[PDB]
């Protein structure tokens, strides 16, 4: 089993690009599909990527998952940062059991 | 696919017991594995149960999941309630291509 760290956070101004990254402690990132999901106050978690770079149906492609095996580790990229664009971001993997694992989540604040 | 519903928002008395319900607009809510999860302001998502009725280790037996086919539902109880059980509350499933679906989350007020 294992755990995904990422950085509480981040900020980065409208029209900019800011990454946000998930480090797997255990095993290897690509063992297992990482999602991430976006959550607002109030709000349940909503997916923005699936199965590691996959975007469901809606959201913006503005949003992109990449997985480095190099530093065991997801990130989710959001180029042309807008002020919508600020809330908690997840990621979320899962364990050899089909536990679910979730990051700390990390907070983005637009400038 | 599908969508899993549940009252945003419930509120009962320390010492009392309360449940959450979701229910499954899809298929059978027995074809896949509810899960729920604890949420307080700032933090990730806790699994207080997995696997439709499993308590991970630490989680006190004052959570108990229920699955009631009849009502394609699934239950959150929590009895003898406590001012720190006052969170949100989602559970969460899975659809035929192992996509993750998450209820609306239930506000917990303990009065």
Same mark, same amino acid.
């Given at each position: 089993n294992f755990m995904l760290t990422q950085p509480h956070s981040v900020s980065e101004s409208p029209g900019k690009t800011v990454t946000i990254s998930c480090t797997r *402690?255990?095993? *290897?990132?690509? *063992?297992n599909y990482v999602q991430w999901y976006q959550q607002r106050p109030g709000s349940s978690p909503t997916t923005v990527i699936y199965e590691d770079n996959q975007r469901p149906s809606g959201v913006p492609d503005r949003f992109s998952g990449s997985i480095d095996s190099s530093s065991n580790s997801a990130s989710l990229t959001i180029s042309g940062l807008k002020t919508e664009d600020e809330a908690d971001y997840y990621c979320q993997s899962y364990d050899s059991s089909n536990h679910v694992v979730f990051g700390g989540g990390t907070k983005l604040t637009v400038l």
């Open positions: *402690s255990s095993g *290897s990132i690509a *063992s």
